[PDB]
Design a protein around this ligand. Structure first.
Ligand SMILES: CCC1=C(C)/C(=C/C2=NC(=C\c3[nH]c(/C=C4\NC(=O)[C@H](C)[C@H]4CC)c(C)c3CCC(=O)O)/C(CCC(=O)O)=C2C)NC1=O
Ligand SMILES: CCC1=C(C)/C(=C/C2=NC(=C\c3[nH]c(/C=C4\NC(=O)[C@H](C)[C@H]4CC)c(C)c3CCC(=O)O)/C(CCC(=O)O)=C2C)NC1=O
Lengths: 54, 158
């Protein structure tokens, strides 16, 4: 048994830990606000209807 | 107080809706008749003394008993009160004509007037005769634009 066989090759990924996701989190909050606004418009339309005209 | 435009605004606001096409047509009709209504109002204002003179003459020629002793217009003071009330009617009719609405007559004039006259013994039928005489005198001058407001005062008084 005399070929050079490489068993434990290092992986591409670096040893560091996961980077923080604060900016991504704020942008997701912005998308959530935009999505909330369109449903809020429907409920607000329901809010402006007259009182006792059922 | 209320004019026609504020009446439309109040209606739409109580329904909680924006103005629609029908309300815009109504307010445009108001703006269209506004200039003729100001001309009538200014003519009444300029000739108010003549209108009062003619209408008081017409009333007291129709009903001479008011001026004789025992009548409700018999004194300088009661006659002055009578012509003053006619002045009120004309002034508030001009206000209503500019506003395009009669609510100012209901609030400032008619509410409590029947009780005032009953308390004082003013003869309401004769006051309505005076309002009718004023309506004729004014119509002889401006046309038929203020007829509805005098009719409103007359219906409210009777
Ligand atoms: C009891 C207390 C009392 C007083 C004082 C009184 C005065 C009086 N005189 C009047 C008219 C009148 N007053 C006069 C008098 C004028 N003619 C000339 O200008 C003279 C200078 C002057 C008299 C000296 C005349 C001619 C009229 C009728 C014409 C008009 O409408 O002006 C009127 C309006 C109502 C009507 O036509 O009879 C009154 C209220 N009335 C009363 O009930
Ligand atoms: C702005 C709306 C308004 C109106 C309309 C009004 C009417 C009015 N008329 C009054 C009196 C009077 N009003 C008259 C008028 C009558 N005499 C009759 O011959 C006529 C048919 C008739 C008039 C056309 C008279 C004679 C009095 C005196 C009553 C008295 O003191 O015995 C009074 C009591 C105050 C006073 O003694 O002067 C009021 C409040 N006041 C107002 O603030």
């Amino acid at each position: 048994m005399q070929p050079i066989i490489l068993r434990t090759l290092s992986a591409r990924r670096p040893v560091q830990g996961r980077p923080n996701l604060e900016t991504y989190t704020s942008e997701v909050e912005r998308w959530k606000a935009i999505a909330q606004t369109q449903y809020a418009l429907e409920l607000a339309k329901e809010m402006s209807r007259p009182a006792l005209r059922t | 107080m209320l004019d026609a435009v504020t009446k439309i605004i109040n209606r739409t606001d109580a329904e909680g809706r924006y103005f629609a096409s029908k309300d815009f047509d109504e307010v445009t009709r108001f703006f269209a008749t506004g200039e003729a209504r100001l001309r009538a109002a200014s003519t009444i204002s300029a000739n108010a003394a003549s209108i009062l003179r003619e209408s008081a003459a017409a009333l007291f020629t129709e009903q001479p008993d008011l001026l004789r002793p025992g009548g409700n217009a018999y004194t300088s003071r009661r006659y002055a009160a009578c012509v003053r009330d006619m002045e009120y009617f004309l002034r508030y009719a001009t206000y209503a004509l500019v506003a395009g609405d009669t609510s100012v007559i209901d609030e400032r004039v008619l509410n409590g007037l029947k009780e005032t006259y009953m308390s004082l013994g003013v003869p309401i039928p004769s006051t309505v005769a005076g309002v009718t005489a004023m309506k004729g005198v004014v119509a002889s001058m401006i046309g038929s634009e203020a007829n509805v407001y005098f009719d409103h005062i007359a219906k409210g008084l009777s």
